[PDB]
Structure 1
Amino acid sequence: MEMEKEFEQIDKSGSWAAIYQDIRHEASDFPCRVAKLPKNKNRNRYRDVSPFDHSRIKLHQEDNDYINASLIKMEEAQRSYILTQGPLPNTCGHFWEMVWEQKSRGVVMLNRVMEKGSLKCAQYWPQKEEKEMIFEDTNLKLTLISEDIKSYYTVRQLELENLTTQETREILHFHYTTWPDFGVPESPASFLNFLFKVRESGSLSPEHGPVVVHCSAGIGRSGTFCLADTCLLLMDKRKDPSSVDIKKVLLEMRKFRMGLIQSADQLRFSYLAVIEGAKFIMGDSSVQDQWKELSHED
């Protein structure tokens, strides 16, 4: 693929840092005035990472509609994502309100609650069936329904109830649990298999609201997941699959949320994932089961 050829070129000339910086320089800059209002200071995990005003998700509250979350709307791919930061101790109700209001079916979590010995986000979902959580501020109830723990990821079914109306929905929680504390996976196989599991669940589909994707800041790994998904989707859809330019797709996504893909390592890994995932796309059926075996599930 023209992508693989470009990949090897960048590798041989050792120019990932320069290409990544090119991305940083060309990326959109839009205002985040709502995020930066003093009253919202504690709704932000990093003063460094803010949703643009034009693409931010608004809570349907009268008293403060702010949450650190962005709608990424990929026109050609016909795919939408909500990228958000890992919930804060005081924003878990907001988070689940957003999931309810946006009609999301899936939540994708790409970080551990604790990494590098520090808390990367709040424990925002119940860990035991018998101990449900109530978010009083937004009047929502959340119950662990089942949990399936595999080697590289865990999938949970949750029941989210609007206590105000007593309607309930099933939310799928996809938790990639093995992203290394430093660097990137090194083999894209298990990440790809995880992406396919999210796809297979229907969570990414047009009949639902946009999937909610988060890591700690909601730009790095989150970025990588959405960039890979969209590129793969576009290669599937277009008459000329080799016309898919990762950098152009990334820059398009950066119109909707800043800082997507946080290092040159993550960029390289994005190429790797797309390239590898493209094998299962041009006819190769017997490779979905070569990512299920290359990475265990025990």
Structure 2
Amino acid sequence: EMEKEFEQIDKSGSWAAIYQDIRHEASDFPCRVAKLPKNKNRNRYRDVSPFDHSRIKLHQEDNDYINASLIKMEEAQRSYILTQGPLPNTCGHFWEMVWEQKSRGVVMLNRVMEKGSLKCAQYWPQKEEKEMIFEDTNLKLTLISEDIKSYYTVRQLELENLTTQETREILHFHYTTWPDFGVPESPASFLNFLFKVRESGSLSPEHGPVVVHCSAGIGRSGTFCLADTCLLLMDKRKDPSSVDIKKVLLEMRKFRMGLIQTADQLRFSYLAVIEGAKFIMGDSSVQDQWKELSHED
């Protein structure tokens, strides 16, 4: 049971060894397509590839490759698309994938610049009046509005398929203060944000899978999806004790490599799940408290 386990791990100081066990148990499947010569410039990181079996295929034509994985959580009945931050030559692909997969929401857990380097292209317009056209994929993207909070921004985007002129609203949930290889500032600030995504309807099974990305699409993104799926599983069962967190992370790792990149990101996942369980089990008021504690204003 997760809170008993948390305490024994903390008491014994053994997060490093627990996280290592995950690494040695994790699935290893091939990534032959990601490693083809023609795709080298579609990958941000040499050592971070989608498995072939779970990769998202673009419905082009010339080259169907994007560095993106469908994490299909069968028992939880929720799917997510995890991807790297788009590169200067893959921003059209990224929006093509959102359109073809019918996603309603994009969760971004990194900043464009982190520690002096460019970890993600500027793939969305910053000003209403300066829309983006992806000529390769025939898509147009316009900023509709934004709601800037102290550590995250929500944007309403309109994505238009220029071939059909159909338009869709995409909500962009941008967490701007989660350091790379780090953890959010508190369970509260993390959960206040996750529940904003949830409240938007972006995670509805009536939409395609939510797109989640950081820079590589594995550390911060795996921590976010792990916490959400564990909360979903105890919610479906109304039974916090039924959730095995490390088993859940190993199931997710069948779909994309490297999910959760440090032992402290694992520890933080336990914290966010233990805390979020209070809301799932019917203490509605904790949501207001997370909002206060997060200092979003």
| TM-score for both structures, normalised by structure 1 | 0.98
Conserved in 1, the CA contact under 8 Å of 2:110 and 2:180?
Answer: no
| Residue-by-residue CA offset, 1:203-261 (whole Å, 9 max, x unaligned) | 00100000000000000110011000000010111264302000000000000000000
Conserved in 1, the CA contact under 8 Å of 2:85 and 2:119?
Answer: yes
Give the length in aligned residue pairs: 297
Taking the aligned partners of 1:209 and 1:14, their CA distance within structure 2 comes to 41
Taking the aligned partners of 1:182 and 1:76, their CA distance within structure 2 comes to 29
Taking the aligned partners of 1:182 and 1:236, their CA distance within structure 2 comes to 29
- Report the Cα offset of residue 27 of structure 1: 0.5
Conserved in 1, the CA contact under 8 Å of 2:230 and 2:248?
Answer: yes
Taking the aligned partners of 1:187 and 1:143, their CA distance within structure 2 comes to 33
Change (3 A) 1:215 1:232: same
Taking the aligned partners of 1:181 and 1:241, their CA distance within structure 2 comes to 29
Q: 240-249 or 57-66: which moved more?
A: 240-249
Conserved in 1, the CA contact under 8 Å of 2:130 and 2:142?
Answer: yes
- 1:37 corresponds to 2:36: yes
- Report the Cα offset of residue 183 of structure 1: 2.9
- Report the Cα offset of residue 267 of structure 1: 0.5
After TM superposition, the runs of 4+ consecutive aligned structure 1 residues lying more than 4 A away are none
Taking the aligned partners of 1:5 and 1:177, their CA distance within structure 2 comes to 32
Paired residue for 1:27?
A: 26
3-state SS, counterpart of residue 21 of structure 1: helix
- Report the Cα offset of residue 181 of structure 1: 4.9
| TM-score for both structures, normalised by structure 2 | 0.98
3-state SS, counterpart of residue 293 of structure 2: coil
- Report the Cα offset of residue 297 of structure 1: 2.3
| Residue-by-residue CA offset, 1:41-65 (whole Å, 9 max, x unaligned) | 0000001100000000000001000
Taking the aligned partners of 1:126 and 1:227, their CA distance within structure 2 comes to 29
Change (3 A) 1:21 1:181: closer
Paired residue for 1:3?
A: 2
Taking the aligned partners of 1:183 and 1:201, their CA distance within structure 2 comes to 26
Taking the aligned partners of 1:122 and 1:185, their CA distance within structure 2 comes to 22
Taking the aligned partners of 1:237 and 1:93, their CA distance within structure 2 comes to 37
3-state SS, counterpart of residue 273 of structure 2: helix
| Residue-by-residue CA offset, 1:253-293 (whole Å, 9 max, x unaligned) | 00000000001011101111111111111121110000110
Conserved in 2, the CA contact under 8 Å of 1:232 and 1:274?
Answer: yes
3-state SS, counterpart of residue 128 of structure 1: coil
Conserved in 1, the CA contact under 8 Å of 2:110 and 2:179?
Answer: no
Taking the aligned partners of 1:26 and 1:181, their CA distance within structure 2 comes to 24
Taking the aligned partners of 2:163 and 2:125, their CA distance within structure 1 comes to 20
Conserved in 2, the CA contact under 8 Å of 1:189 and 1:291?
Answer: yes
3-state SS, counterpart of residue 182 of structure 2: coil
- Report the Cα offset of residue 185 of structure 1: 2.5
Q: 279-288 or 64-73: which moved more?
A: 279-288
- Report the Cα offset of residue 187 of structure 1: 1.6
- Report the Cα offset of residue 186 of structure 1: 4.5
Taking the aligned partners of 1:158 and 1:228, their CA distance within structure 2 comes to 26
- Report the Cα offset of residue 172 of structure 1: 0.3
3-state SS, counterpart of residue 183 of structure 1: coil
Paired residue for 1:80?
A: 79
3-state SS, counterpart of residue 41 of structure 1: helix
3-state SS, counterpart of residue 222 of structure 2: helix
Q: Considering only aligned residues, what root-mean-square deviation do their CA atoms show, in Å?
A: 0.9
- Report the Cα offset of residue 295 of structure 1: 1.4
| Residue-by-residue CA offset, 1:169-215 (whole Å, 9 max, x unaligned) | 00000001111356323421111110000000000010000000000
Taking the aligned partners of 1:166 and 1:244, their CA distance within structure 2 comes to 45
Conserved in 2, the CA contact under 8 Å of 1:113 and 1:123?
Answer: yes
Change (3 A) 1:181 1:65: closer
- Unpaired segments ≥5 residues, structure 1: none
Conserved in 2, the CA contact under 8 Å of 1:186 and 1:269?
Answer: no
Paired residue for 1:152?
A: 151
Conserved in 1, the CA contact under 8 Å of 2:82 and 2:211?
Answer: yes
Change (3 A) 1:43 1:181: closer
Conserved in 1, the CA contact under 8 Å of 2:219 and 2:260?
Answer: yes
Taking the aligned partners of 2:97 and 2:252, their CA distance within structure 1 comes to 21
Q: Percent identity over the alignment?
A: 100
Conserved in 2, the CA contact under 8 Å of 1:104 and 1:209?
Answer: yes
3-state SS, counterpart of residue 53 of structure 1: coil
Conserved in 2, the CA contact under 8 Å of 1:3 and 1:271?
Answer: yes
Change (3 A) 1:269 1:203: same
Conserved in 2, the CA contact under 8 Å of 1:43 and 1:88?
Answer: yes
Q: 177-186 or 26-35: which moved more?
A: 177-186
